[PDB]
Amino acid sequence: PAAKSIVTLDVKPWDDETNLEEMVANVKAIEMEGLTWGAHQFIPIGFGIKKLQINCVVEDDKVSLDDLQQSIEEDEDHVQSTDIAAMQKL
């Protein structure tokens, strides 16, 4: 089998009023060969702001995480930034 990694991405909104369900819907609509979306939660970060924390599993040779972050950040109406919360080998 192909080498894989499990990654947790933090996807940050613009403010406390951003539509978070739309934000995660847009992330989950991204389709890349070798990318599997997993579980997600909305986690408070303070002052009423919540970030999206979402898992994905990637085939190392097929999915660039730099490219995936860039793709997610194209949703400028909802997303301010993305960051890698954690990543592990599978």
Binding site: A3, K4, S5, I6, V7, T8, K12, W14, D15, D16, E17, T36, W37, G38, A39, I43, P44, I45, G46, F47, G48, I49, Q53, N55, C56, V57, V58, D60, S64, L65, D66, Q80, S81, D83, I84, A85, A86, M87, Q88, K89, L90
Partner: protein
């Protein structure tokens, strides 16, 4: 249930080393990640016979469940030892992990190198161009000075003492060339699949008297890998150093105003302090600090906090700027900085004028390699030549960098998280840098 200190560990090793089963066993038996999935497979395992099950079988099923995307827990994994709460990374083979190892949060206190004991597997794992050696080199370069070696798959070589000794000798050569002193490193013969010497001592090797390591106070000995991890030395945290808090994001909240968010890297942030943001130089008072759901009296090194400040628009401070204390070595922008750069394997050569993007803390800025000042022996730092005309893979060099946009960096000796960086090009990290001087 005793109070624990926190440490970070990174586990490295070749694809055939069994390092994921090994790390997974520690988390299963000493932590609490994805326990509902573990429980489902422990019960399911009754189907293999009459009830007994191997932890490695459950780990295999857990891995397939994670691949399906239906496990619940995030990828931040922890486990406990008698003394510590350990945050562990089973290093990904992903090439984008290199930058995350250099500029990500949670840098390691100790690296654990997992080695396959089998003849073909062992040799494949110590190749000079392998991903494992690159991970060990990056850890050494970043100041990870503690290392544990676990020689896995000992069953496959019948727990033979000579085989273990020859692997210890060969691995000691491997790690010495990277830079580690083998006398300070425990070598533990384990079986990640069968549990030998993981949490309990093996009964398959009567010759085994335990591992040892030299420390500054004496010689530390044990039998298991869990004892070797508990024996990691307590590193000093930067609570009393001046505040440094690189910004990740900046929000405008109705009724609250400006709320920068970032990780406290050094020092402590408290309501009522007067802070400064650099490269801009804006100063203001911290009104309140929050983290997760709690309002804080203080945010300490490692806390990812939100804080509210007045008379700062979200337009004047941004991701990559650095907040610090106006009355204790306030952070500043630089005109240039000189750093030791270690060139990784990559399809190119570096000459003065090269201007790739550098990732340093939360900043992402192209910086010119303005001058190649020296080429150095990597391990000792000795100057080999003045003004080398180019740098190739493996070279260590002192380089003067000039940032293309306002940037706040620090010397690594003073503020480690703001003094290490990754250089990106050709879809990879092509070099790692440690900052040695800054012209503020």
């Amino acid at each position: 249930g005793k109070e624990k200190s926190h440490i970070n560990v990174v586990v490295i090793g070749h694809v055939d080393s069994g390092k994921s089963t090994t790390t997974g066993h520690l988390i299963y038996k000493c932590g609490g990640i994805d326990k509902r999935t573990i429980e489902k497979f422990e019960k399911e395992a009754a189907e293999l016979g009459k009830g007994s099950f191997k932890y490695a079988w459950v780990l295999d099923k857990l891995k397939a469940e994670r691949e399906r995307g239906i496990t619940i827990d995030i990828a931040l994994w922890k486990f406990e030892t008698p003394k510590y709460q350990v945050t562990v990374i089973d290093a990904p083979g992903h090439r984008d992990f290199i930058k995350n190892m250099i500029t990500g949060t949670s840098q390691a206190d100790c690296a654990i190198l997992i080695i396959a004991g089998g003849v073909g597997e062992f040799e494949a794992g110590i190749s000079k161009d392998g991903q494992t050696r690159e991970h060990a080199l990056l850890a050494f370069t970043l100041g990870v000075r503690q290392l544990i070696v676990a020689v896995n798959k000992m069953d496959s070589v019948k727990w033979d003492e000579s085989r273990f000794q020859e692997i210890v000798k060969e691995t000691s050569n491997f790690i010495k060339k990277v830079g580690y002193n083998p006398k300070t490193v425990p070598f533990v013969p384990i079986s990640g699949w069968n549990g030998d010497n993981m949490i309990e001592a093996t009964t398959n090797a009567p010759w085994y008297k335990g591992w040892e390591k030299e420390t500054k106070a004496g010689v530390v000995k044990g039998k298991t890998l869990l004892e070797a991890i508990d024996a990691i030395e307590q590193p000093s945290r930067p609570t009393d150093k001046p505040l440094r808090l690189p910004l990740q994001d900046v929000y405008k909240i109705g009724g609250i105003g400006t709320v920068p968010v970032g990780r406290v890297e050094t020092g402590v942030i408290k309501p009522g302090m007067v802070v400064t943001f650099a490269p801009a130089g804006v100063t203001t008072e911290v009104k309140s600090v929050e983290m997760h759901h709690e309002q804080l009296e203080q945010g300490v090194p490692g806390d990812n906090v939100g804080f509210n400040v007045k008379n700062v628009s979200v337009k004047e401070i941004r991701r990559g700027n650095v907040c610090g204390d106006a009355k204790n070595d306030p952070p500043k922008g630089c005109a240039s900085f000189n750093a030791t750069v270690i060139v990784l394997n990559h399809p190119g050569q570096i000459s003065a004028g090269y201007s790739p993007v550098l990732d340093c803390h939360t900043a992402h800025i192209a910086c010119r390699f303005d001058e190649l000042l020296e080429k150095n022996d990597r391990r000792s730092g000795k100057k080999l030549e003045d003004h080398p005309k180019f740098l190739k893979s493996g070279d260590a060099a002192l380089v003067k960098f000039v940032p293309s946009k306002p940037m706040c960096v620090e010397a690594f000796s003073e503020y480690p998280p703001l003094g290490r960086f990754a250089v990106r090009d050709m879809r990879q990290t092509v070099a790692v840098g440690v900052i040695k001087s800054v012209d503020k």
